[PDB]
Amino acid sequence: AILTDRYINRGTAFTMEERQKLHILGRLPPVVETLEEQVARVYGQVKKYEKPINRYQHLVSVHSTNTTLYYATILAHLEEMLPIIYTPTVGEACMEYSHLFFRERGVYFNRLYKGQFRNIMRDAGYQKVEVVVITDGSRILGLGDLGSNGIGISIGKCSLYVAGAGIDPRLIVPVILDVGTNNERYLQDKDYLGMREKRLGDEEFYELLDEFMEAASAEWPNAVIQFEDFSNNHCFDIMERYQKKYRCFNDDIQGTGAVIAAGFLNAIKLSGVSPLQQRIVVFGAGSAAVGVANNIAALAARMYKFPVQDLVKTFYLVDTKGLVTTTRGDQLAAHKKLLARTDVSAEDSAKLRTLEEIVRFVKPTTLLGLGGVGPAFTEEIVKMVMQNTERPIIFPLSNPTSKAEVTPENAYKWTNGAAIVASGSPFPPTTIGGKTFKPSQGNNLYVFPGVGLGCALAQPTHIPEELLLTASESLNLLTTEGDLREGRLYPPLEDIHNISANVATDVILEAQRMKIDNNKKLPRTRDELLAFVKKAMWKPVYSG
Amino acid sequence: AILTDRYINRGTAFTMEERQKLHILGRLPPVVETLEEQVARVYGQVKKYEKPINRYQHLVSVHSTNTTLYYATILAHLEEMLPIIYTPTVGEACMEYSHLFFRERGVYFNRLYKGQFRNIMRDAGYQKVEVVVITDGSRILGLGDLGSNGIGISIGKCSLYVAGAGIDPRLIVPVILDVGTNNERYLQDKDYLGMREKRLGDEEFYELLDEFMEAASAEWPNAVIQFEDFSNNHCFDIMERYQKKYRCFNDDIQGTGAVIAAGFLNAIKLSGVSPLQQRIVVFGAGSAAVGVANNIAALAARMYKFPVQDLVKTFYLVDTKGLVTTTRGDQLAAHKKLLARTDVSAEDSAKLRTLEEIVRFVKPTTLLGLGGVGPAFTEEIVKMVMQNTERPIIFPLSNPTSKAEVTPENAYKWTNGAAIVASGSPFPPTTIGGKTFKPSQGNNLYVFPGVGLGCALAQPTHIPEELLLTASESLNLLTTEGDLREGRLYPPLEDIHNISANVATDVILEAQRMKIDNNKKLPRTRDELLAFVKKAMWKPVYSG
Ligand SMILES: COc1ccc(NS(=O)(=O)c2cccc(NC(=O)c3cc(F)cc(F)c3)c2)c(F)c1
Numbered sequence A, B: 001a002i003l004t005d006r007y008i009n010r011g012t013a014f015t016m017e018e019r020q021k022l023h024i025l026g027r028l029p030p031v032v033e034t035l036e037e038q039v040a041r042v043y044g045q046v047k048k049y050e051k052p053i054n055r056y057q058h059l060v061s062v063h064s065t066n067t068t069l070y071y072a073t074i075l076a077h078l079e080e081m082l083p084i085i086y087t088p089t090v091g092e093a094c095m096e097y098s099h100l101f102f103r104e105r106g107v108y109f110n111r112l113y114k115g116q117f118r119n120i121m122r123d124a125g126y127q128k129v130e131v132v133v134i135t136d137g138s139r140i141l142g143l144g145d146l147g148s149n150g151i152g153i154s155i156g157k158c159s160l161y162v163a164g165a166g167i168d169p170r171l172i173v174p175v176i177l178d179v180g181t182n183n184e185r186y187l188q189d190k191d192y193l194g195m196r197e198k199r200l201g202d203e204e205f206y207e208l209l210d211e212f213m214e215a216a217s218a219e220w221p222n223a224v225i226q227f228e229d230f231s232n233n234h235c236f237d238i239m240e241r242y243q244k245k246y247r248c249f250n251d252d253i254q255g256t257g258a259v260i261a262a263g264f265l266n267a268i269k270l271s272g273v274s275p276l277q278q279r280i281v282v283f284g285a286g287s288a289a290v291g292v293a294n295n296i297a298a299l300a301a302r303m304y305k306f307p308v309q310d311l312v313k314t315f316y317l318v319d320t321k322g323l324v325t326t327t328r329g330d331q332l333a334a335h336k337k338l339l340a341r342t343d344v345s346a347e348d349s350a351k352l353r354t355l356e357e358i359v360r361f362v363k364p365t366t367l368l369g370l371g372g373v374g375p376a377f378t379e380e381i382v383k384m385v386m387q388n389t390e391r392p393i394i395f396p397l398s399n400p401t402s403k404a405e406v407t408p409e410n411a412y413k414w415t416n417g418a419a420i421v422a423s424g425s426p427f428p429p430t431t432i433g434g435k436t437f438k439p440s441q442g443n444n445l446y447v448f449p450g451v452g453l454g455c456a457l458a459q460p461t462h463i464p465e466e467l468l469l470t471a472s473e474s475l476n477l478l479t480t481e482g483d484l485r486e487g488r489l490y491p492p493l494e495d496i497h498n499i500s501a502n503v504a505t506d507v508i509l510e511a512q513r514m515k516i517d518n519n520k521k522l523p524r525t526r527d528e529l530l531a532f533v534k535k536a537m538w539k540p541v542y543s544g
């Protein structure tokens, strides 16, 4: 019976004497293993499988039998497991293997349960819930509507809070708000188990998501609510609607920008071109891309007290028409007006349409790739940036690797190793003339876990932009002299527990300064708080 | 919590009103399905996977979440699921994916636990256990020693008692007696969890298996003990040691022969060549092959009261030297002397070495393939049998299909549809000149489940050869006039519950006649007993 409880089961780690005492002698094969030995064994069982999706299926089975062993395996092989346990494998599992999520602790909402949301939460019988991940399966990148099968996205994200910040796996809740699906295959699929209708309109959407926030705030009062993988028609509006009234954030919007800003300011430090001397092409002019630019400006203003207006003038925003300027004779979308050039004539605007001529005119020191239109950063463009700086900063952030603006390999080759590169995705190192270069991956894992752990300990009334900026700065400052010497823009991913504890500490101190913190038991000075935060984290080791 | 109990979990079959009452509204996606709908959905999830081993892995996951749904899926698609849930996929799962068995209810014995066997059984906390499958992983066919990974063979076989005869899945126990392994890969594999030593010698082997039988007889007194997949050096000796003192049998030896005999007597009925007019080449002279011949003789003697001596003279036994005769000038192994020809000269014996000349001399009406040396039944041999009978009986029983003596397709083609064929393995039908022929598969599933259900109800003191013969005859008699008209040698496999109930009834009546039955509550007349046996079977339907 202890064997059948995944939270306390140790499998072959139960000693002979423990097996005799627990009456489980003969329920296990005779070999006794340490946790490290069980991890090496699982890692081999995983690499037996060739397909990401079968590796995932194997790890799901470990998770349902031995939760400690699962999280211990992830933490020993984090960089390699991350693309299997979340993006992009988790989406493929949701889309075509949703049965992998059936036995997990999801909470399912829909219009049929209108007015019962709070009873459904009370009935789940969870104690002091710390983190709730919710999706409607609409997808941030707008591809492959998963409807009800979105529950797997919430399950995978909840697992990254546990692995990344030692949120107790008993105190995380994955939610699907099923407001229907526009997935035509699913609408006609006899085996789709969700609401078989097109996505509700906005008024009914917000009636249900309002009830969910109010029910969660009453029944899970200690929880952080994190919006995952909501489509662009809703994700920005959801934060505007809830950010002040509930303890909530959106990792896709706020996490991404905090991690990219941290990495970019370290690229500036390495580049020899100080923040006010940077000329930054922002290739892509969506709301997300502009939010990342603004996050960069906000962090450089916090860390260096340059006037934010002067930081904004380092940005050269490029949409599908070309360089965004006040003189090019169109009515600009609201988000584009802030970053619009005021220093460019109508006549020059007309000659600044293709990325190549924009780069030749602007003479940038940085290329930020947020475009999602393939390999726009060509050899010619990259060799033009080498004319403006000894250390071109090149960030191909468009997902997946096929949408990327340039490969890190070409960035390094074309610059003879001078390029400073951050990627959305992991890449193998590149060796040029005996010298090795590897891009810095700005993974969202750097920030959301520590925001979750900080907000779980501090119990703030809400999560204002100040806490995200603090988490951005905290992450920047964790890149050591030694990391920076080796060209790293972030502390190492494998150190995620120490990263999360430090992000959490800084978030807590910021909540304490703003007096929005509801937990008065916490220390109020950084050294003592950091020790207290570390002690509070759940660890994937056998404890009893 | 009801959802997390695989025995009572109904998943999406819980109605809306049931979900509200059980407080699980919002723990499931909103679609409500019947069991039949859940089965169709699972069957599609299974056929999504291309590889037998991934289909198995999928079915294992269903089994660990919803036991009723698992057994309902097997019974709806039995013929197609059988090669996935047992031979040959179960062996490949044991050999390379033993982690699939970790979460199942195995009991593990080894020399380290000597003298504790009964405490290990008492600690398992099972109530009125009916069926125990035990293996040591040595393998009947002597290939791929699995050691401790043999537990998966016991697990799969236990599952066939539940599916086949409605043994309650709570009342079956899979056992591995780990007496070491001769698998060199495993002896050197850091991840082998069993006893890391060569197989114990016979004296220590029997010390441990003795303690197991005595402990099982005391702690699981109502159980049938069935030996599965033991190597030829032990399997015959084990039955000789235990058959009278304990309630036990070996499916590989006794099950096989009872099913082959049933099918062969139906082939005789269809062939127009009555039992005393049959001339049977037994291609293969191992103990198993001779036991099958003797099972045939024993059944024809029971059903027809021909003198058994006259039935024995229909057999022409062929070993690696050639036709087994009293005059060929070697000292015959004991098992070969009974079937030795007394009517063949030393001079003819010398000219009867190759199967071709043996067939030309003997002029057989039947070829029994138990040889395990590939496709020995050639076009020439098959067309020679067409000279001796209008309906050649051709049974290629050697496993797997590559060791088989002939394909059913060639048997039918070469005889223009006249051949009466039984196979070890399923084959697709063959169409010749617009007429369709399909071989009869003599699956062991026809007999062991009903022997298990009969011995579970009757609680006989032991399982004498009389009960196996009765089960053989019972199975023969279940092939209806209609089945026989269509060329079927066995009732249909999909009817396995009715088959098992009828086999069980006949086994019980035989135990009652021999006064070895310990359960006095049972009816003693066939019609009333059969109704009572049917009522007692566990059914894979939702009941509460
Ligand atoms: C893919 O799933 C995996 C699960 C566990 C492990 N490793 S392990 O070391 O946890 C282990 C090793 C071998 C056997 C057990 N057995 C059990 O945990 C067990 C549980 C039960 F609920 C009832 C039971 F009888 C026995 C565990 C694994 F590598 C894969």
Ligand SMILES: COc1ccc(NS(=O)(=O)c2cccc(NC(=O)c3cc(F)cc(F)c3)c2)c(F)c1
Residues within 6 Å of the ligand: A099, A100, A102, A103, A104, A105, A106, B003, B004, B005, B009, B010, B011, B012, B013, B027, B028, B029, B038, B041, B042, B045, B058, B061, B062, B063, B065, B066, B069
């Ligand atoms: C491969 O495994 C399968 C398992 C179940 C089904 N079908 S089903 O109809 O049983 C079903 C359908 C959808 C969801 C649930 N959920 C649960 O059974 C469940 C259990 C728990 F222990 C806790 C929990 F919160 C929920 C079940 C399946 F096709 C595959």
